[PDB]
Amino acid sequence: EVAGVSIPCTSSNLVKAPGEYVIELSSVSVSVGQVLTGRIVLASGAISPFTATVVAADHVPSTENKLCS
Amino acid sequence: MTSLEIAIIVAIVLVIAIAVGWYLYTTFAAAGQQTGLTATKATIYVTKDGNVYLNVTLVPQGAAQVAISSIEVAGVSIPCTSSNLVKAPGEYVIELSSVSVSVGQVLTGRIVLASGAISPFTATVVAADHVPSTENKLCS
Amino acid sequence: MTSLEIAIIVAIVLVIAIAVGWYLYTTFAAAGQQTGLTATKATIYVTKDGNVYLNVTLVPQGAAQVAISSIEVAGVSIPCTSSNLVKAPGEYVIELSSVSVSVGQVLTGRIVLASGAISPFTATVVAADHVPSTENKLCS
Amino acid sequence: MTSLEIAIIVAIVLVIAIAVGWYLYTTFAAAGQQTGLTATKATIYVTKDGNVYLNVTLVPQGAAQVAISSIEVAGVSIPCTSSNLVKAPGEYVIELSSVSVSVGQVLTGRIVLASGAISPFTATVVAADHVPSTENKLCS
Amino acid sequence: MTSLEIAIIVAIVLVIAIAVGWYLYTTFAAAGQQTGLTATKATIYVTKDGNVYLNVTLVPQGAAQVAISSIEVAGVSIPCTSSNLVKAPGEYVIELSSVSVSVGQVLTGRIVLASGAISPFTATVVAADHVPSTENKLCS
Amino acid sequence: EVAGVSIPCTSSNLVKAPGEYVIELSSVSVSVGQVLTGRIVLASGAISPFTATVVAADHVPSTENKLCS
Amino acid sequence: MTSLEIAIIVAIVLVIAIAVGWYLYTTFAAAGQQTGLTATKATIYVTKDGNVYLNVTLVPQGAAQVAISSIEVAGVSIPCTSSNLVKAPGEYVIELSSVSVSVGQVLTGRIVLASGAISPFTATVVAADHVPSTENKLCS
Known about the structure:
This is part of a larger assembly, with seven copies of chain A. Chain A is mostly loops and 69 residues long. Chain A has strands at 35-36, 52-53. The first copy, chain A, has no helices and two strands. Chains C and D meet through helix 1 and strand 2 of C and helix 1, strand 6 and strand 7 of D. The PDB classes it as protein fibril.
């Protein structure tokens, strides 16, 4: 859940090891400069917040380590 | 004490420990959902025929669907009883009913949420032609 | 309590404390990226044949790639839908479409960014001969 | 219970107690090593031939060897893949690759660490003659 | 759990709590010693023979012995490698090496400390006869 | 009896030798991270508790040493 | 341990829990009573015969009966040893003993409380006819 938009995860939702992971946001329309918070809701009950800013980029990376596909 | 005692005591003790631990988890999960509105752009528009409308851009801080209670701008309060939910960041249009302004002035304002948090405006007036016919209205 | 309870509670409290601590770290790391544009030199140039173009020098404040939304100079607004990113400090050239001016006037201006920040101009007009053919265009 | 029972239970109980206690000790010893960078002086220098370089003074907060990931100044990011360790407090020199500035401007920036914490600059530009040939380089 | 366990855990927890508490005390005692220079009077004096010297009054803000690094006045930097400690509030005399000025001008400057803090001057020039022979020199 | 759900055992309910055994749980719906307790009720009267946590896994093991089939 | 031990330990542990918890409550209840004065209107009035008096309006910030220690206006200090309590928001009248002023001047001042907090004035002088005979005097 980021900026009020909730996104369910029904596949590859397991974190096997520490690393860098990439999550696609579906329909959130933002603009460069804004500051967005968020949460990662786990299955057990614990959570983890985001407070992540927006930065401009060119292309979607084609790599592994996706979390909600 | 006899192992019967340790059995009884460990059972009750473990029940209490699990209860308090997941109480802490639930408290954290509830405090993480603290939310509120914030504005990044606001410019009151006025048409030639006197119709005025606010064209603001909202971004919900947190992970929740904030509920807008009322918009108070330039002393004129405006209740909101429909479409008062901010579902996602975007550009929203709020119609001002009877505020009579003139091009050039500077008007401040507030967005009062249902929880208690607010947000100021510091918005100027700019001349425009026609009321936009689009979605993303906040108080209809 | 029994060391079983202290084990459970220490595990949960450690998880929560680590989460909140790195939440604070991420908040600081995100607030450190607050950015905005600033100008250090601006002089609207006019050619003999009527072509006008602004020759401004920008410096991005912060550590980010700011996005220019629109240029409003002397009441004429100009949208920007391509190459609207400022990658590094330098001298940039913006074509003004239809503003008809005369040598000597003093014009104001504003650069409206996407995040909300702005920047004034207080730029004057100076005579020039030909439109420069170079890179570093901002709104094409 | 029979002394056999108290023997068994005290053995297991003591093992668990020692485990949890030294778990607390090790958690404290790991939390004591939380570290981060801080800056006390930074003035970007520019040579007559266009070469620019940052002459910053770093002090590691904590008791550890912090690792520098990247330096972002005025929107220009610079990765660091060698000599990116801050071993002790001192004056360090970082070369900026292609940033083109002019004497007098005011530039901000960040030092992004490997753990996540950062440190901002707000460093001004000053004119200088020659690039210094010395040790204590951070991104080569 | 057995009071043997409570003994072990209370010992370890008390050690950790005392450590963290007096850590808080030491952190507060170190943050309370933050210091810096401030000026209340400065008038660059000039003699008939061309010798110039600044007659400034310093007051250390805080409770510490600030260290003066360099004096930069009107673009001329002057290093300080001796007597660069400010022991107590009072009137201090700094000699300027080669700055050639004329009565009436207005010069600004900075006192750059070792920690990072600075202080401006906004000091005018006034005519005087002879260089004073007294103590309280800052950069000799 | 685990997490309030009781499961009878009417076949291969004998423990021949110390070792690792596998019991299928019929309808208990859990989520990764929770902490469940339990009991093994014997025929003589003595019992044995569990306090066993949940861990994610991929496939049901196809092996011997089942206790309630 | 035997249930006798758990009985003793739980008794002492619960006593300590209640003590510390209601200590936290009482600390919060005491910190919530932090108070101080604030002014919203002040205009020193002067009569034709030389009698001067300040006609101020006070509002106690907090929930308490603040105590006024002294009034210092334009360098003249005036002690207060009676009626020095502000019981409720309202308009209060303070007599100035020997301050000799003239219509038009601009005077500042302070209200020094017993706790330590203060409040400035920025109060101008205005001509008036007679000293008002009413209640709500602060230093008699």
